Amino acid sequence: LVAIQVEALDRHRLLSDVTRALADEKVNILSASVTTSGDRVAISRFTFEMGDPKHLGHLLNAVRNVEGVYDVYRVTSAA
Amino acid sequence: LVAIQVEALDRHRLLSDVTRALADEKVNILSASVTTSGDRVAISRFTFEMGDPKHLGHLLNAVRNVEGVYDVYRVTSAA
Incomplete structure (x- = not known):
């Protein structure tokens, strides 16, 4: 149940x-879900389950190739 | 600032x-933002500004054609 x-x-x-x-x-x-940070910044949040590391690993790297996307961070933390 | x-x-x-x-x-x-209401049901929320009713009206009807979508309800708040 790791988020992104x-x-x-x-x-x-x-x-x-x-x-x-x-x-x-x-x-x-x-x-x-996606919410605007300040003005010209859009912060998206995707919560899904895990299974294959190759897919989760390639996913992050893939997002990097998304023109306009700053970066991706797996959301979770304590609970 | 009407929602859906x-x-x-x-x-x-x-x-x-x-x-x-x-x-x-x-x-x-x-x-x-969308969340799982129960099991095979997810409540999706959308906040967007609009002026013309024809577009907001046609949008709702169009969503009905979305395979998997049960129904749509304009979300709003007060006070």
Whole structure:
């Protein structure tokens, strides 16, 4: 049940890009939500289950190739 | 700042599909978040500003054609 925070420029295409990029593999997410940080910054948050390290590993690296996305950080912390 | 509650099966694919429709019509979304209501049901929330009712009206009807989505309800707050 590890979450993921995808940071990207505040746009209307970047969001669909992240959702689409991950959707390409029908990655069933337990929770998807995006909120604007300040102004030109869009912070997305995807909560899903884990299984294969190759997919979770390639996922992060893949997001890096997403033009406009700052970086990705696995959200979780204590509880 | 009206919101929208889209109920659909717990699948990110549904969220991405709904987001695609929004961007397709230049629908600038301020924010969004979906959570699993029970088991095979996920409540998706979307916050976006609008002015024309024809677009907001057609959007709801369009969402109905989204395979997996039970129904949509305009979310709002007061005070």
